[PDB]
Amino acid sequence: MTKNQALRAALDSGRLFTAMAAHNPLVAKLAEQAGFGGIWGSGFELSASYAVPDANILSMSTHLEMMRAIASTVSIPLIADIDTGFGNAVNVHYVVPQYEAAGASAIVMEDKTFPKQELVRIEEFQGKIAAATAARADRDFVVIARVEALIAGLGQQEAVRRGQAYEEAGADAILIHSRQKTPDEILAFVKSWPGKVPLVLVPTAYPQLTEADIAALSKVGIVIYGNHAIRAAVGAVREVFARIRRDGGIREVDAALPSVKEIIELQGDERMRAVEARYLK
Amino acid sequence: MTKNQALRAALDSGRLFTAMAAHNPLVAKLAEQAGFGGIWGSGFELSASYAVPDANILSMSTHLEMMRAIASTVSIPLIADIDTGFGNAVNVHYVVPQYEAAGASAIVMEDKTFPKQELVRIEEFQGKIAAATAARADRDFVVIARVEALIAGLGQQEAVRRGQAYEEAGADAILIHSRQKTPDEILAFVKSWPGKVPLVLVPTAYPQLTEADIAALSKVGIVIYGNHAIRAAVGAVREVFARIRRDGGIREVDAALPSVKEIIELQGDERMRAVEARYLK
Amino acid sequence: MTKNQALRAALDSGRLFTAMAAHNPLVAKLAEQAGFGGIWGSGFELSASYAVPDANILSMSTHLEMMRAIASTVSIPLIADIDTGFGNAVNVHYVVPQYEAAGASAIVMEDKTFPKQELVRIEEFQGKIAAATAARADRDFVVIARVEALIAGLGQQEAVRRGQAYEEAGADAILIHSRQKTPDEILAFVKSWPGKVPLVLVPTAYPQLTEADIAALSKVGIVIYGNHAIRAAVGAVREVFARIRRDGGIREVDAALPSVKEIIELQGDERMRAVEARYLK
Amino acid sequence: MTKNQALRAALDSGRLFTAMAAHNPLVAKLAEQAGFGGIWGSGFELSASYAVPDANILSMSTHLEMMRAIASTVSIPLIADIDTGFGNAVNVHYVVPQYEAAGASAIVMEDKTFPKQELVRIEEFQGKIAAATAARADRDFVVIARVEALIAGLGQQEAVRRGQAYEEAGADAILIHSRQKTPDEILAFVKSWPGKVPLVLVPTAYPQLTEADIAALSKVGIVIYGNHAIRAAVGAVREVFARIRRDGGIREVDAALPSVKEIIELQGDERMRAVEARYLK
Ligand SMILES: [Cl-]
Ligand SMILES: [Cl-]
Ligand SMILES: [Cl-]
Ligand SMILES: [Cl-]
Ligand code: NA
Ligand code: NA
Ligand code: NA
Ligand code: NA
Numbered sequence A, B, C, D: 001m002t003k004n005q006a007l008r009a010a011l012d013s014g015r016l017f018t019a020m021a022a023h024n025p026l027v028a029k030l031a032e033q034a035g036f037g038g039i040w041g042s043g044f045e046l047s048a049s050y051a052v053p054d055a056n057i058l059s060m061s062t063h064l065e066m067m068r069a070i071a072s073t074v075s076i077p078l079i080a081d082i083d084t085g086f087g088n089a090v091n092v093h094y095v096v097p098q099y100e101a102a103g104a105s106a107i108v109m110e111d112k113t114f115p116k117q118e119l120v121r122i123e124e125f126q127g128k129i130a131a132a133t134a135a136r137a138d139r140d141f142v143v144i145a146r147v148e149a150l151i152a153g154l155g156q157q158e159a160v161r162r163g164q165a166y167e168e169a170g171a172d173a174i175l176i177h178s179r180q181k182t183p184d185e186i187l188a189f190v191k192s193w194p195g196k197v198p199l200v201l202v203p204t205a206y207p208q209l210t211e212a213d214i215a216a217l218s219k220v221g222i223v224i225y226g227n228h229a230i231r232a233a234v235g236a237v238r239e240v241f242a243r244i245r246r247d248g249g250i251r252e253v254d255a256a257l258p259s260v261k262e263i264i265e266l267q268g269d270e271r272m273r274a275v276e277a278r279y280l281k
Helices: A001-011 A023-034 A043-049 A060-069 A089-103 A122-134 A155-166 A185-194 A211-215 A227-249 A260-266 A271-281 B003-013 B027-035 B042-049 B060-071 B091-102 B120-136 B157-167 B184-192 B211-215 B228-247 B260-266 B270-281 C003-013 C025-034 C043-049 C060-071 C089-102 C120-137 C156-168 C184-192 C211-215 C229-249 C260-266 C268-279 D004-011 D025-034 D043-049 D059-071 D087-103 D122-135 D154-169 D184-191 D211-215 D227-247 D260-266 D269-279
Strands: A017-021 A038-041 A079-082 A107-108 A140-147 A172-178 A199-200 A221-224 B017-021 B038-041 B077-079 B106-111 B144-147 B174-175 B199-203 B220-225 C019-020 C038-041 C078-081 C106-110 C141-149 C174-175 C198-200 C220-225 D018-023 D039-043 D078-081 D104-109 D142-147 D172-174 D199-201 D220-225
Touching: A001 A017, A001 A140, A017 A023, A017 A227, A023 A038, A023 A060, A023 A260, A023 B042, A023 B184, A038 A060, A043 A060, A043 A227, A043 B027, A043 B260, A060 A079, A060 A089, A060 B228, A060 C060, A089 A107, A089 A122, A089 D269, A107 A122, A122 A140, A122 A155, A122 B017, A122 D269, A140 A155, A155 A172, A155 A185, A172 A221, A172 B174, A172 B260, A185 C060, A199 B042, A211 A221, A211 B270, A227 B228, A260 A271, A260 B042, A260 B228, A271 B038, A271 D087, A271 D122, B003 B017, B003 B144, B003 B220, B017 B027, B017 B228, B027 B038, B027 B228, B027 B260, B038 B060, B042 B060, B042 B228, B060 B077, B060 B091, B060 D059, B091 B106, B091 B120, B091 C268, B106 B120, B106 B174, B120 B157, B120 B184, B120 C268, B144 B157, B157 B174, B157 B184, B157 B228, B174 B184, B174 B220, B184 C220, B211 B220, B211 C019, B211 C141, B211 D087, B220 C156, B260 B270, B260 D104, C003 C019, C003 C141, C019 C025, C025 C038, C025 C229, C025 C260, C025 D043, C025 D227, C038 C043, C043 C060, C043 C174, C043 C229, C043 D025, C043 D260, C043 D269, C060 C089, C060 C184, C078 C089, C089 C106, C106 C120, C106 C174, C120 C141, C120 C156, C141 C156, C141 D220, C156 C174, C156 C184, C174 C184, C174 C220, C211 C220, C229 D025, C229 D227, C229 D260, C260 C268, C260 D043, C260 D227, D004 D018, D004 D142, D004 D220, D018 D227, D025 D039, D025 D059, D025 D260, D039 D043, D039 D059, D039 D122, D039 D154, D043 D059, D043 D227, D059 D087, D087 D104, D087 D122, D104 D122, D104 D172, D122 D154, D154 D172, D154 D184, D172 D184, D172 D220, D211 D220, D260 D269
Parallel strands: A017 A038, A017 A221, A038 A079, A079 A107, A107 A140, A140 A172, A172 A199, A199 A221, B017 B038, B017 B220, B038 B077, B077 B106, B106 B144, B144 B174, B174 B199, B199 B220, C019 C038, C019 C220, C038 C078, C078 C106, C106 C141, C141 C174, C174 C198, C198 C220, D018 D039, D018 D220, D039 D078, D078 D104, D104 D142, D142 D172, D172 D199, D199 D220
Antiparallel strands: none
């Protein structure tokens, strides 16, 4: 199975597909090794790893090359965060094929306007979604529409009307996001979702909602961990930099770290040893 | 003081300058906040963050743009790892000015051959060093020669002859590296080093050697922590990915992580709020 | 004089500054040698050289690196086309400093909306312009506001109100564009322009308007040749590809071409010979 | 037929395949329209378009992205110039797959050393060639070995021994180059070439040798026009910049140029009109 089929196969089969965030290939590799179904090429995480606000500051090609870098590193499907398409349907049409070519198996686009109506018009986004499905070469590539209506405070009625409108435009799945610190809003949506396609959750704000709780929701097809990679990294590097400057060295801290040999193994040293062995003459 | 002056000022003043590794701008920012004197734009760390062996696999422009990204993020000096210059003196001449323009305050180049004599000839490297000092625009930019003779097993006599030869070619500082798991080899070198310029240590293999032990060595001007950033990151992301897949969620793990608000603050949200406030009209 | 001063000096002095389009460094070099005052880092030309419509398809970093490439090649000032700022004032604030750092001496931004009101609101653009002038480090860097009102068909009254509004927001110069195949519209504007800053023309559609005719217009400070580089290139490569395939070889066509030695000289072979001579040891 | 099959099919079929140089996608597009069999992603041309000596100055990723840009623009096969592999067999192993992924249907690598033995050892290059054929995913991707022995002055005997050694290592075709201003050296080689694979010519120095003369040589499978694109461009831009500065305008020169509408058509405006028409809602 190609990555696109692996992904599509998970959606059609009914399992719950788990996707972990990743701001670089090594991190994506570790997620693969930890057993997630796929990687999340988060715009937030990458812009965070660059110390820049997540407001379309990072160049679009910066995200694209990172996606290329990751897809060529892992064997599991990659879902790319392309925000709002970098423009209108025209931009979407030229963009999507580049992501598909970088190796992503799906892309996520939201109906928010660019730049900071909080959202674009329904018919306008339907058009941006149709442009996406048309632009793709392999029918397996998944296109996920992201409804930001709840975040907007437009209401549940409008959120479902958008999700349904997007589904009719050709969206393969719907990512519905919620602000509330309680997963009441999200659940309410799931329960009333009438559309035929799978839903996507990014339960970052309501960490009380487990995979078991989401698996219980037949309508949710994918779960996405949106920013734990960068958070895990920040928390640990920060603490280790504090210990080094408090201890005035790395005599106490070295022991608690992965060894250098472990980093070389994650770099793909084995593959390199075979190459050197059979071709370096 | 410009970054180049800050660095040069530390070398002339006699303090011990501490440099921490960094594979991305956020990590570099955290090092700055932890109080290191400067950042180390490590080739090992970056190629590691890309899951590729550190054997000149990563494109030279990949390292260059990361250095540009970091220098524009931190206010402290950046020392760039340019390996062996990406070729000969000609390559060195065209390369150095690009690094200086990305914003690095120094570059580190080694006398190893490319690709895998383990080393290049003395006169050849002297020439690559002279080409570097000539190519630089601001005389403050620091050029550090890296003697790999100990690693080569050519001996102490040859290591000092190289370091001295490089110093006469114009090298501002000498990075001398050692394999031994004990800092016996390194110390021996320091003690017999007759050259007039400052020495650089990257005590990664002998973590028993503290900053106090190195400060005791009047001849060492800079200490470099070569790969603790990527190791700290790997160790923590790995553990958090294991917990999530063992717990089947992030209900237990979320509490132990830096919050999302903390990541937004590190992204430079404050600067962005002021901009939006005064210019978004 | 730094490039920024050279440019600013031309604006304050009253001469007419000529800027030629360029889609790559070699072409920019040739323009310098032909004697233009500066280079025009055209979005149209670059997207054209990439066979893509000029509708914000090319990545923003693609244009940025080309500008970096050109500024490091020529010694004359470079004016970068940044279209509409790649977003709103926030985007403008983060963007401008990158262009200034690539080496551009000025940037041109237009009040058209993104993506396809044909224009943004006056106060909104004023804000995008103020964000630009605030974001710049060297006060000499020039910020040029581009009024697209005539193109919009909003009228002369509105075009001058925008140009004046932009000037009060801090715009150093005003680029006013016209559709008409006759330079009647443009002239009318110039004559009625009351603002204190210099005007910019890109007389591409009305080629009957010479530099003498524009020099006659005391209010115009800069003349820009918008797309003759790419047109000159297309016309000649096309003809030479036709001759080769019609002649079944390059026996007839080789004579009419610049020699290979001439291309090596434009590559900077002389500088390379000196480097090899003094540092390749 | 995929591009790789189109190429391979030309080699097996016995026709003479013509390849034209190209330093950017538009130029490559024009070559396609002029009817060449394929494009030549020349390192010389690209480094020339950047005003830098062709001595491995341009970043490897700079060439790679240009190849990606071109392959996504044309429908005919692209042959990428990868020089000497950017290192040894290890570098070759990691590199080739990136070029294959950018979309190239073949790569050309030479047995010259890096950086400036003029050549590497026979067994060493055999190894670099075997590493290339092993690294490729689609068996159709073509690997072309480039023998620089004549240029080296090692002689004909040694040139054929290399070409044969490379063929046994798995090289699909042999590019043999000559200095002489007369095609005597080249012909001599062709006549004595005993190997089973097709030969490649880049008759740049002996323009008296037509496609008919080369078609007469049953052993030559591909003809490559190495630098006429950049030469054609330089000659015309130079002349047009001279006329503009001599005429003090573009009133005389505009008439002799391709129109702006013609450039928009080459940018793919038609495709964009359809997209805007069916998806911009
Ligand atoms: Cl990273
Ligand atoms: Cl990165
Ligand atoms: Cl070009
Ligand atoms: Cl280009
Ligand atoms: Na990153
Ligand atoms: Na990284
Ligand atoms: Na170009
Ligand atoms: Na080019």
